[PDB]
Amino acid sequence: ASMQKLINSVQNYAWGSKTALTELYGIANPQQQPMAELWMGAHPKSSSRITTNGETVSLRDAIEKNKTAMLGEAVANRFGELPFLFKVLCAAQPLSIQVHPNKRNSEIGFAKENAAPMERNYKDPNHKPELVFALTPFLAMNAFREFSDIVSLLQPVAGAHSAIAHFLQVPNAERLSQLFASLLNMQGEEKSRALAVLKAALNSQQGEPWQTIRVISEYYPDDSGLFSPLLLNVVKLNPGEAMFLFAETPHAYLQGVALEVMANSDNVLAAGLTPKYIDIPELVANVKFEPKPAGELLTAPVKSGAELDFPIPVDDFAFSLHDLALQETSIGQHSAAILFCVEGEAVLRKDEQRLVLKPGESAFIGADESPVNASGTGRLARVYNKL
Template sequence: MNTTIWKLQNEIKNYDWGSKTAITELFDIANPTQKPQAEIWMGTHPNGCSVAINSSNERTNLDSLIQSDPLFMLGERTYQQFHGLPYLFKVLAAAKPLSIQVHPQQHKAKLGFERENQAGIALNDPKRNYKDPNHKPELVYALTPYKAMNAFRPIEDIIAGFEKLNCPALSDFVQELKRHPGAEQLKVFFQTLLTLPKETRQKAIAQLLISIEKKDDEVTSLIKSMVLDYPDDIGLFMPLILNVIELKPGQAMYLGAETPHAYVQGTGMEIMANSDNVLRAGLTPKYIDVTELIDNTRFHSIPLANLLTKPQINQNKIDFPVPVSDFKFEIINSDEQKRTEPVNSPEILFCLAGQVTVETATDSFTIKPGESLFIAFGAKEYRYQGVGQLARAFN
């Protein structure tokens, strides 16, 4: 009988915004080199593919394993639509802000990827925008208090925020937005900020920092914390333009295409389409292609109250619905009762707490915090038991 369940060995990414302690504290994963541990990647993305280990301790690259029998591993539905594992599952531990970014819609990602290939821009070129032809919707689930920026604030809030500052270098642009408070002028305002001449930008940032010196609200505190790493970055104005939100542990938020966002601080699970396409808008030393960014941004305000994903509770499971077919995300609260779960797609289970035994018809593994399993579609079902909590990725 074909094996249907494997333990995963996953790559840890040492990006410089990562925390040196969070992953060790939560999951007891050692950090002997004391480098930042920013992300754990679970999946088949070529930039960090997991290794699958069977019960005989034989190891196979997860992508090779899936491609060896894609219908058995993925199921007909997932195979026909995606031809591979459609999602990338991560633990993300941010000690300082990530770049402000936008992800393209599917059709624009496909066109952009083909266009850059034809232009002969290497995949590892810093000026490359599209690393693959896929969109990158995301859901983040907070494991600790998790601060982020997501989506444009209502325009009247943006205007009010700037008017509280003494920032003459930008006052003409703010007045123009006040005269025409709609999506088109918000686009002009955003583009103007990102393309300010160096001298004007430096003057605006200096005025911003002087005017917030004695203030201590959520937005100004965030700007002050960002100055340490990005003293000359136009992204310092983004907390005035984007919603600032702090998720409590157990809350989740969806981040759709064409919506500017940035993770600021905290540890969470993140699930996304299997893509690495990022268009940056600030808080970064990396390349910013303003034309491409503006073309892939929807200038649409979302009130803060609408950002959280409303969970659906189904007995011992908490489901966080998303509007895409690439992935689904669920929290499973397990206890001593043995429960059976049907399998309709390839799944990854990541243990958040306790100790849970998961078995299919072929094999059984017991996992503790920080450990994960891959379950093939061909398993049809699995059983789990033990006091603990699992994060479940499927589609």
Template sequence: MNQTIWKLDNTIKHYDWGSIDGITNLFAIPNPTSEPMAEIWMGMHPLGCSLAIDEKLGKIRLDKLIKDNPQQILGNKTFQHFGSLPFLFKILSANKALSIQVHPTLENAKIGFAKENQLDIASDAPNRNYKDPNHKPELIYALTPFKAMRSFRAIDEIIMLFEKIALSDLTIPISQLKNNRHPDQLKHFFEYLLTLPTQTKTALIKQLLMKISTFNDEPYLTIKTLAKDYPDDIGLFMPLLLNVIELKPGQAMFLSAKTPHAYLSGTGLEVMANSDNVLRAGLTHKYIDSLELINNTNFESMALDQLLTKPVIKDNKIDFPVPVDDFKFEIIKSDQNLHCEKVDSAQIVLCLDGEITLSTESQSLTLHKGESALIAYQTDVYHYQGLGVLAKAFD
């Protein structure tokens, strides 16, 4: 294999929650049709596989390139452990909320995938929960102010927020939670909300929006914003249950399996295990399976100051440690000096700013802002030079 670094041509996803100009403003990637440009996928997931630009053969699907050269590209350790590229790297830009969701554990993903296969549910069926047998831990890195909800608030805080709006139909469930401040009781309350009959749910949402109409603080402002896009959705109660957080540019947050969350607005980078398994509870027009989501949710509370991933800074690199083997993530600041980079596994690098040249003894490739490249394990060592910033996903 002569070539070991390939520029990538990536798949763009035009989901309805995407921003029309968020990615264009940051990376000058054109959007001639003015469709929502929600995500750009960098990797080999079958629902959005990148193309590698080969010097001799032109564009090759990344999954085929890796399948034909698995150990040279992945390295023996990754190949033996995962069998393929274990991560998916994305640019994500949200103009409105993504669904309230959780991702299953690896064990539950395997069970759910096999079960739905046995039921002959088509892989692209709208009522399919499990698209693959993999888990989907993920890290989000903010490029702009990035608003999200994640993990349950402290139960005392949840009780206080619900008591402030004093909805008569929730008096008994809140009283039960108040008398038994335990994750199991929080689960019962959460399930009660998600499984309300349509008529009761509609009346309750109407009461909620009426009660908070004069409130001008969080999390009630978030509820009002969500109501513009999802006026009849039970997800409007989630800001009272989940932490609302806004990441500043340069901050990151890791989400393990079973963590309830929703991205609300902003542009960031997302790196995750190579999976598209999503269980949804609200703020969406897609398929909702509340009971499957509840069975895959962690109901332990997390404090707001525990939500961010603490960076480790060393020389010109910022590392965001994650507790999984599927991926790692770094920000690399490049200058006009020639820097040496050791390659221990396949890497995907994205140029966030400036112009950076990657070089080996036989290759040279320049990345401009918004461009990305795959670097094979066989590269062993490469150099980078130029004023700019790289984001690196690897395992």
């Protein structure tokens, strides 16, 4: 078949929602497991599957047998595999603060460690650009605030730690870096003092980001990352809005449901909201202490005909939304594509073949089968490559 309806895996990670995939899309969950991520892709730990005679096969294996035809020549020669993983993320609790090192440092790091597996910081030599697209209202942290915004926010907690007073005396990148590292390094009486000053300020300071710190504290009451919302932008994405997660930039997913597209990597440097050991020097060497103003956080999409593209400054993946109507629209690309029904209902057509996708269902389109025609109602999301 030209168009392959996908059988996708659900990761039942303990932080997942017991209800989100079921309320949104009707996915069955009779035993009320946590359903943390719905995977659409070719990840070796749990590849999506396709149906051929009626047998299913791994999308990863099917791609391995026919790379050029499935991926297109450009992706096949550049990546040698499907270069992205596409997920529905439904976090019932707030998740960890993370940083992804850039390509060059990821390669330096991976080969620094390879001499000594797999506590290693670099699981591979790849960067991990990501884009998050809100399906429900989505609370996140992303990137450093403007310095004068941090100054504002730290006044009420100046007493918490001498690193805060040091930053406020001279609020620059160097002292922000020292602060970030000193916060995450706090121990014993020092951390306890700091958290008790923060606790108190939560009683006297109303609104954001204090509210977000209260929300985090439910799940991470003894964590030095409780200070992070004072340093990092707290953003509430409305459904339909998106943000790109740059290298060397701390971020966290705190509440709600999103689509996420990522490059293939597992280099995650944790930066708080975790019980795991944090290598602070490595972390700091891979963080860009440069403010990102609020106005610059969301990705500005561009609408052309029925297509809303989200420009991504990397080659690893591209992402677009397609409005559906009665009249067919042609969806084409030089690469493999995964098409996901966000809402409404999509009828995909390739020559004689027709494939219906309801909300939350997806299809794989191999490079050789582009373009396909889409009609119906609502919207389809596409992950593809523009190379």
